[PDB]
Amino acid sequence: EDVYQNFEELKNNEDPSDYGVVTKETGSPVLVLAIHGGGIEGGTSEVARELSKEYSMYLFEGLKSAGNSVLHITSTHFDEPRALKMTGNHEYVISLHGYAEEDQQIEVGGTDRVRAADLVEKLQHAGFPAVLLNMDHPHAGVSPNNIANKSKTGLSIQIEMSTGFRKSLFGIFSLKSRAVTQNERFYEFTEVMFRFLKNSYL
């Protein structure tokens, strides 16, 4: 259960300094989406911002010192207006999430079945712990109500990264210091992503 059922309710209940919506619009067909950024699913902000060097980006960040879990709105309820505009303006969506798990794992889902499979293969061959989720797996990212699928095509890749995998990418795992302590593994991972996105979406 989320604390809030939609963005309007969150906005009505939370101080605006405690969260932040950030966009980068470049006209690229692909949109990188991180609706659980900041301290909600830590590290998804940093991955998104790095990929924004080449792609359009939507980011929703929890900015509290603690308790950002209350700002999580699940994808099928996430209706912040700038996200609705950005998703609808793009052809494809890559959506970044984090789930609680100490082992390093990357779970890949989404509606774009051939691209999701390719990504898993590329990640595996590059030495990263990716698995493909299929359509009946929980949190497979296939609902039409999922914000990531409200694009021009409906084709998405949903990347869920375990806590252990995200913690491996930063010297200090905090809101304050993740961005400035990105390590060699962080750039190795995002370079595999850059290579995949450029090849996969021509």
Contact footprint for other proteins (CB under 8 A): 36, 38-42, 62, 64-69, 72, 74-76, 97-100, 138-143, 145-146, 158, 160, 163, 174-175
Q: Are strands 106-109 and 130-132 parallel, antiparallel or unpaired?
A: parallel
Choice between 57 and 142, CB closer to other proteins:
142
**Contact assessment for residue 7 and residue 51, using Cβ atoms and an 8 Å cutoff:** no
Minimal distance, residue 156 CB to other proteins, in Å: 11
Choice between 50 and 61, CB closer to other proteins:
61
Minimal distance, residue 129 CB to Zn ion, in Å: 18
Backbone CA torsion sign across 77, 32, 163, 135: positive
Minimal distance, residue 82 CB to other proteins, in Å: 20
Rg (the chain; Cα; Å): 16
Choice between 6 and 29, CB closer to Zn ion:
6
Q: Of 23-62, which residues contact Zn ion (CB under 5 A)?
A: 36, 41
Q: Which two tokens stand for residue 10?
A: 């969150």
- Candidate residues 97, 150, 166, 178; the one interacting with Zn ion per rule CB under 5 A: 97
